[PDB]
Design a protein around this ligand. Structure first.
Ligand SMILES: [Mg+2]
Lengths: 313, 268
């Protein structure tokens, strides 16, 4: 009932730390590093890492440099993904390669990666036992391999019908691994036992799937297939399924007429609502996994992240 | 001669020799060499893009290979490595990649103009010297090296990277600056300094021209002697370590002990 552990101000404390490390006016490699970091934004990843560490009894001083590490790793990956990405959102800020040139944007992503690795190395001096610091690097690295594999698969799997599970596995690596990178490393430094880490893993995967579905739904309120498209295909009769596959199969058709053809078929078979119910089931599975963790304001914070509109990546 | 030149001067032999020279165990250096392999290859895949096979893989694969290095390095604890040494390897490895990134930035921003002799040396000390320190620092750290030894591998790593990148400039004989051109700038009066800078600043192929003007003003010769000074500093740094066959193996690598193929392997 009553909180027996505290609830700190995670969001602003992170921003102060990253700004302290790369303040306004930095030059050299830190200038391109800072460009990827600013505007700071919500930083739900670093927020999730510290909350996961505190949910298992960890230290703020230990989890804080790991939260900085993750931001640098994710921004470095995002800086490199922008180079290979083609369609840009109007809201999305100008890509670093468009601003600094493509060669500089690659070096910048590398500086972001190694600044992350350097920040995670500071956890030893922060108080974490060297056995835990090394396990944090292992959890972080494997998550970094799933997000990179998904980015390549996003490029390859597009414009073709895939199995519903094949989409689910990819979005678990694109979105669930972003959270598992936060929850796994945060829980590890926090001293979570083996059962707690698996729960945070289940929470990360289930919430990552749900977030992606919610993103797939925004066009249904890049011309790539999404879960509402797959669910509509599964429900559509054979004649319509034939159409859905050839629409995806050939990368030589105008974008507008492609989109409207997909949007009409999704609406005809309630693909949007079906995607909502799938997302809803995985949200409840994420909250179920949380119950393994001990009750705390931090565990309440992770469950609040499952509320629609609260999580933003 | 001596130990015959083999080509492809890479960390796997620097890392293991560095680990054993300070008393390390072979059971850790082998999976560590695999970890270093990943990070060095990923650095190569990115180096191939900046000096203009597929763009997504060359980047993302280069990115993922960094993760393999750090994951495998931590994995070495199950091989029997002390967790405290592994943690320090993370710090050593991370700061080396920061030097490689900082150097590659200078390469793009220094092109087409004369830099100071000191600035070029610092750049390649972080570009290619850190690449060797990646092997020495990790191997020595996992090997149980003292702080004085780790520093001893540090000047050895840099001074070695300095020399061979100069040797690369010597093999040649964007308008990127090289040491022979730079030392030619020091001796020439303004009349020839003015010439040198315009060539760096028209088609690149014909500007065979650059080769003509470096030969007319003794570009190539000047850089050789600077290389040999760093050769000795690398050998001096090794004397801090205790004598062993591992120490001898590192000491020959200062004289050319691998082919031009090493510079082709730094490339390829
Ligand atoms: Mg190069």
């Amino acid at each position: 009932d009553v909180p027996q552990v505290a609830d700190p101000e995670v969001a602003a404390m992170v921003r102060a730390e990253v700004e302290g490390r790369w303040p306004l006016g930095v030059s050299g490699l830190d200038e391109v590093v800072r460009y990827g970091l600013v505007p700071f934004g919500k930083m739900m990843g670093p927020w999730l890492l510290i909350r996961s560490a505190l949910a298992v009894g960890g230290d703020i001083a230990t989890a804080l440099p790991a939260a900085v590490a993750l931001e640098c790793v994710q921004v470095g990956a995002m800086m490199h993904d922008d180079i290979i990405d083609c369609d840009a959102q109007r809201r999305s800020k100008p890509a670093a390669h468009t601003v600094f040139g493509e060669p500089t944007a690659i070096v910048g992503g590398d500086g972001l990666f190694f600044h992350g690795f350097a920040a995670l190395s500071e956890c030893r001096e922060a108080g974490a036992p060297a056995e835990r610091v090394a396990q944090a690097f292992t959890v972080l690295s494997r998550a970094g391999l799933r997000i990179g594999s998904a980015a390549l698969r996003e490029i390859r799997m597009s414009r073709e019908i895939c199995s519903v599970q094949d989409y689910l596995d990819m979005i678990a690596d694109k979105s669930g691994a972003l959270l598992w990178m936060a929850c796994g490393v945060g829980g590890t430094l926090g001293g979570a036992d083996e059962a707690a880490l698996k729960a945070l893993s289940q929470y990360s995967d289930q919430l990552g799937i749900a977030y992606q579905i919610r993103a797939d739904l925004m066009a249904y309120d890049n011309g790539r297939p999404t879960l509402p498209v797959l669910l509509a295909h599964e429900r559509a009769p054979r004649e319509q399924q034939l159409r859905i596959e050839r629409l995806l199969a050939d990368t030589a058709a105008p974008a507008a007429e492609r989109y409207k053809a997909m949007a009409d078929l999704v609406g005809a078979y309630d693909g949007a609502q079906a995607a909502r119910e799938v997302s809803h089931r995985h949200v409840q599975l994420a909250t179920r996994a949380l119950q393994t963790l001990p009750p705390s304001p931090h565990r309440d914070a992770l469950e609040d992240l499952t509320v629609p509109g609260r999580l933003v990546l």
